[PDB]
Design an enzyme around this catalytic site. Structure first.
Site, PDB file in Angstrom:
ATOM      1  N   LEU A 142       8.279  -0.347   4.755  1.00  0.00           N
ATOM      2  CA  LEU A 142       8.645   0.710   5.692  1.00  0.00           C
ATOM      3  C   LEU A 142       7.490   1.675   5.928  1.00  0.00           C
ATOM      4  O   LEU A 142       7.341   2.210   7.033  1.00  0.00           O
ATOM      5  CB  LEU A 142       9.870   1.464   5.177  1.00  0.00           C
ATOM      6  CG  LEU A 142      11.102   0.614   4.867  1.00  0.00           C
ATOM      7  CD1 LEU A 142      12.160   1.454   4.176  1.00  0.00           C
ATOM      8  CD2 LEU A 142      11.652  -0.013   6.140  1.00  0.00           C
ATOM      9  N   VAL A 143       6.667   1.917   4.902  1.00  0.00           N
ATOM     10  CA  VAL A 143       5.606   2.917   5.029  1.00  0.00           C
ATOM     11  C   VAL A 143       4.616   2.539   6.129  1.00  0.00           C
ATOM     12  O   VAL A 143       4.224   3.382   6.945  1.00  0.00           O
ATOM     13  CB  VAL A 143       4.895   3.125   3.677  1.00  0.00           C
ATOM     14  CG1 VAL A 143       3.627   3.958   3.856  1.00  0.00           C
ATOM     15  CG2 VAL A 143       5.831   3.800   2.688  1.00  0.00           C
ATOM     16  N   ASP A 144       4.207   1.272   6.184  1.00  0.00           N
ATOM     17  CA  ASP A 144       3.093   0.866   7.035  1.00  0.00           C
ATOM     18  C   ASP A 144       3.482   0.501   8.467  1.00  0.00           C
ATOM     19  O   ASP A 144       2.592   0.201   9.266  1.00  0.00           O
ATOM     20  CB  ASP A 144       2.322  -0.291   6.363  1.00  0.00           C
ATOM     21  CG  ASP A 144       3.046  -1.647   6.431  1.00  0.00           C
ATOM     22  OD1 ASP A 144       3.901  -1.889   7.307  1.00  0.00           O
ATOM     23  OD2 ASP A 144       2.737  -2.500   5.570  1.00  0.00           O
ATOM     24  N   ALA A 145       4.767   0.543   8.823  1.00  0.00           N
ATOM     25  CA  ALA A 145       5.218   0.027  10.114  1.00  0.00           C
ATOM     26  C   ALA A 145       4.515   0.679  11.302  1.00  0.00           C
ATOM     27  O   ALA A 145       3.802   0.002  12.062  1.00  0.00           O
ATOM     28  CB  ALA A 145       6.734   0.206  10.241  1.00  0.00           C
ATOM     29  N   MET A 164       0.667   0.220  11.342  1.00  0.00           N
ATOM     30  CA  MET A 164       0.266  -1.123  11.748  1.00  0.00           C
ATOM     31  C   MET A 164       0.453  -1.323  13.248  1.00  0.00           C
ATOM     32  O   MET A 164      -0.366  -1.985  13.899  1.00  0.00           O
ATOM     33  CB  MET A 164       1.050  -2.172  10.962  1.00  0.00           C
ATOM     34  CG  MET A 164       0.776  -2.172   9.467  1.00  0.00           C
ATOM     35  SD  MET A 164      -0.804  -2.853   8.948  1.00  0.00           S
ATOM     36  CE  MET A 164      -0.426  -3.205   7.231  1.00  0.00           C
TER      37      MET A 164
END
Lengths: 134, 77, 266, 52, 77, 76, 77, 52, 77, 77, 77, 77, 77, 77
Positions: free
Chosen positions: G57-60, G63
């Site tokens: 969830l953190v990198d969505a 990215m």
């Protein structure tokens, strides 16, 4: 300097004047010195060093208990504690044998709640026996 | 003249941001080092080894920025 | 002799490109848009170092004894044990592919990084004057080709286990139902899954690429800018630091490959 | 800028790096070899005594 | 000339942001690693392993930024 | 003309950012130094020695920034 | 004209901010991972899975920003 | 940068090196460790049976 | 002319960043001093001497910034 | 020039600040998720459902920005 | 003419950054002063004495910034 | 033409700053929510009620900021 | 006469930075006030006195920033 | 063209910084409120009455900034 006392809950372990010490604690081993803080709590299986006048030490096994720290005269209340030449390297090696068997003989969390304590007591003995050689 | 007065600003921003980043990263890391050295003074050399390892990690990217700063300083002007 | 820092950097940032449309050498100021223009130098270094890995490991594997090992066999069994322990930490399936995959990745990436420790002008000089080649550079792992090629193989391998049992079962069930079993969060969570999934391998590629690319750059910068009597004092510390960098990057590329495939199967 | 000079400087840098590596990395290298050797030897000797 | 000139600043901003992000992230992560090493001296070889595990992911994205910044300053220039 | 005031602006940028860097870094580092020394007043000299060492590290990059800012203000 | 380098500037700012966000978010998250792993070292295989879950969830958004930046850098510009 | 047909050549090279390690290098290695472990555990068994 | 208009801006930015840095640095240091003193007041004069010893190095750089800002504002003008 | 490049810049601002906000907010929230999971390793299903509940609201307002930036790059420009 | 625009902007930047610095510094210092006051009441006057001593140094540079901002606003422009 | 083309930029600034503010505020607030849920797990349906009580106050200002940004893009420009 | 439009911007920057400073400072201060009230609920009318003694120092600079910005926006412009 | 445009830009910066201020301040303050609620739940109806008092001060200064932002957009146009 300052005074220290130790009891094994069915035996007195030490009582007398002292300069400095090193002891275990709530999470792990800890370097203790006189005059630093005023509060106190519990002990994980470990050991204690007692440096007295003219710089003479001794080394005691602490199987579990509580530590005062705050007062000039401090004391350690230990549910079980053994003197550094009442115990021996052979006894700690027997504890090592027991613990290494029990690690193989413990398979659930409920029984490991005891196996881990047995291992910790053995490891505490194995560290105090090495510190005893000084 | 017109061309060069923006290149030193580019280099300036690179090195300033990298310097703040690295300084505060090492600040956090070394603050934890001293906190740890407060519990067991005996482990101060062992923790010093660990500290320089992780500190080598911390300054990695900022060092790239600094190198390109030197490049601009002495080849691009 | 028209050598300057920027010209020197320009020479060192160029591969030995050979255009396969006419099978001719591409000089540095001459770069075409075509695809079939394979680079000789770093590609040759790459395959040679992979062959070195296989040759040493075969010259020991064809003889390895179960007594007290020799001083050379012991190093290879140490790296074997290191890879085996790392895989065994992160994998529970029975497929034997994971372990040689990780071993090749580790050692091949390590050797290609190790090339970065060499003096920047040694082999390129010998290429230019002894042989006559227009350009050369020594670090294969400092290429998008090498790093993303290995990453793309890893991507194929990701979908392999994701489409075995997971593919007939989980992958379909997970993409349709989980997390909240709704019709509107199928597309949204598919978007999240798509970008995340595709970033997993590309990140391996670009991570290792960035580290080696910048280290080779740092050596080039020191050589190009500073006079000879002062280059040494800044060149040595970077080499010492880059040993740690190369070890860690080989390790991390390996490790993240193992984690991806393990989650794909288990 | 002279390129022969750059080669000379690179040579000095490489020599210093190699000497540093030889005097801080290689001396402790064989620790794992010693560990495996000693562990294996003690285990096998104790087993020999166990059989007798 | 502005076509050449402005990409120096563009690469400058990419690399500055990459430096701050990487440095501060590694600082926080390694600081927690150091305190953990301080309390339990026996678990350093374990926490170090997990530290490198997590550090790879932390530095994943800053490497993207810094590599593309180098690309901007040297490839398109 | 337009050249030199922009050079002063660039020098301002480097040397102010370096001010931030060094100030906050020493703030955090000395904050842990003082709480550790308050916990260990017998070991103040030891921790202060460590403080010099990690001070060297914490201001390593900041002093690079500051020196190069001096080159931008006074060396050109 | 200047549209090429302006588009690179837009993509550069977006991707650098994405690097900031992803780096520091994963730094905080993994720092708590290691603080949990030091305390219960037999729960590393479980916490290391929950870390996958929330790290995903953190990198969505970062990215997505990186992908769109690549789009502007190479498709648009 | 220089995305090149080299990337595809190196993909084939990557899988070929994986195949070479898969066929020749890795399969012959497993046995030695197990043999060496076995010859140490049996001694502990022998000591237990002596005491018993 | 334009010179003075930009030079007041330059002095402004330099001294603003200097102000932020110095103030917040001493803030961080003094907080830990006060908490430790609340636990045990016998150390207050001692720790306050330590406090000045460290606060000098905190104010080292920001007063370079302030001196050069005052120089730009009153001497370059 | 001025029509398209400003729209790419506006989308860059929108989605970069969305990246910052979403990433750091979820980092702060998931840190407490993992701390709770370390304190109560029997409650992880309960705490992760609570985490989903809070996570939806954290992500909701950045997602407007992300979708609207996609609108700006692909529908307007 | 061209003078007052940039001179007001310079004063604005100066006093805005000063307003950040003083506010945050006194925030940290007063927060620790209050948790000390909660920890040990009946030491409030002594801790408040120390609190004012430190606050005097915290507000040093920001007050120079404020004074010269007022100078620029009401004397130079 | 530049008049509305910069209104898109204005809305970008407005609602991006709103995004970061709202995200971080809810992040801190929910972090305390989860730690409270970990200390008293039999208490979650009360503390979550309080969380929804104060989250509306947190979002009250950012929501009107976002609304005005959407108005600026779609109505005005 | 272009002079006005920069003066509104210059007022905006002052009042925005003042809002940030004077909001976050009182947030940090009042948070410790509330935890002090949580421990010692019978002391609340004493800690309120101390809190209003300290909050007037937190709002020393920011209210001057608001005063002079609100002056620039109306009297000067 | 560009007078009415820059008025909207000024309102954008004003209300964005105000949004950051209000959101972060109440985030910190309400986090401490929730910790106080968690430690002594039957005491919430008192701590909430203290919370609203402190929250009023926290948002008092952001809200005049917001008011002047809407004044700049709609009244000055």
């Amino acid at each position: 300097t300052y005074h220290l006392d130790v009891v094994s809950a069915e035996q007195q372990m030490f009582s007398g004047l002292v300069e400095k010490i090193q002891v275990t604690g709530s999470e792990g081993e800890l370097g203790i010195y006189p005059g630093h803080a005023p509060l106190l709590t519990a002990i994980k299986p470990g050991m204690i060093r007692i440096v007295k006048q003219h710089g003479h030490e001794e080394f005691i096994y602490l199987s579990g208990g509580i530590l005062e720290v705050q007062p000039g005269n401090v004391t350690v209340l230990a549910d079980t504690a053994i003197r550094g030449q009442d115990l021996d390297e052979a006894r700690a090696m027997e504890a090592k044998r027991k613990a290494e068997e029990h690690i193989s003989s413990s398979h659930g969390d409920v029984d490991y709640a005891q196996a881990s304590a047995e291992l910790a007591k053995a490891i505490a003995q194995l560290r105090v026996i090495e510190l005893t050689k000084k | 003249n017109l061309n060069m007065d923006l290149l030193y600003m580019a280099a300036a921003v690179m090195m300033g941001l990298a310097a703040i980043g690295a300084a505060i990263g090492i600040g956090i890391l070394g603050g934890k080092f001293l906190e740890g050295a407060a519990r067991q003074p005996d482990l101060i050399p062992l923790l010093r080894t660990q500290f320089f390892i992780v500190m080598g990690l911390v300054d990695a990217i900022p060092m790239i920025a600094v190198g390109l700063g030197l490049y601009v300083m002495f080849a691009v002007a | 002799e028209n050598m300057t820092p920027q010209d020197y950097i320009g020479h060192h940032l160029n591969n030995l490109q050979l255009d396969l449309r006419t099978f001719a050498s591409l000089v540095d100021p001459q770069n075409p848009p075509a695809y079939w223009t394979i680079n000789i130098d770093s590609f040759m270094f790459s395959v040679v170092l992979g062959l070195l890995f296989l040759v040493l490991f075969r010259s020991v594997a064809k003889k390895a004894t179960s007594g007290v090992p020799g001083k050379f066999q012991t190093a290879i069994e140490l790296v074997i044990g290191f890879v085996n322990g790392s895989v065994k930490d992160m994998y529970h399936g029975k497929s034997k592919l994971i372990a040689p995959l990780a071993l090749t990745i580790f050692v091949w990436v390590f050797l290609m990084n190790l090339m970065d420790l060499l003096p920047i002008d040694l082999l390129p000089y010998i290429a230019e004057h002894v042989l006559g080649l227009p350009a050369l550079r020594v670090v294969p792992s400092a290429d998008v080709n090498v790093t993303l090629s290995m990453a793309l193989g890893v991507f194929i391998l990701i979908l392999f286990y994701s489409i075995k049992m997971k593919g007939i079962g989980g992958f379909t069930k997970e993409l349709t139902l989980q997390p909240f079993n709704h019709w509107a969060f199928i597309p949204v969570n598919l978007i999240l899954e798509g970008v995340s999934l595709l970033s997993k391998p590309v990140s391996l590629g670009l991570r290792l690429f960035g580290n080696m690319y910048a280290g080779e750059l740092i050596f080039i910068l020191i050589a190009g800018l500073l006079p000879w009597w002062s280059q040494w004092i800044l060149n040595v510390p970077w080499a010492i630091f880059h040993i740690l960098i190369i070890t860690l990057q080989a390790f991390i590329f390996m490790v993240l490959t193992i984690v991806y495939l393990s989650m794909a199967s288990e | 800028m002279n390129l022969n000079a750059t080669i000379l400087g690179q040579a000095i840098a490489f020599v210093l790096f190699v000497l540093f590596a030889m005097k801080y990395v290689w001396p402790p290298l064989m620790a794992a070899i010693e560990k495996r050797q000693k562990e294996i030897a003690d285990g096998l000797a104790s087993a020999e005594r166990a059989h007798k």
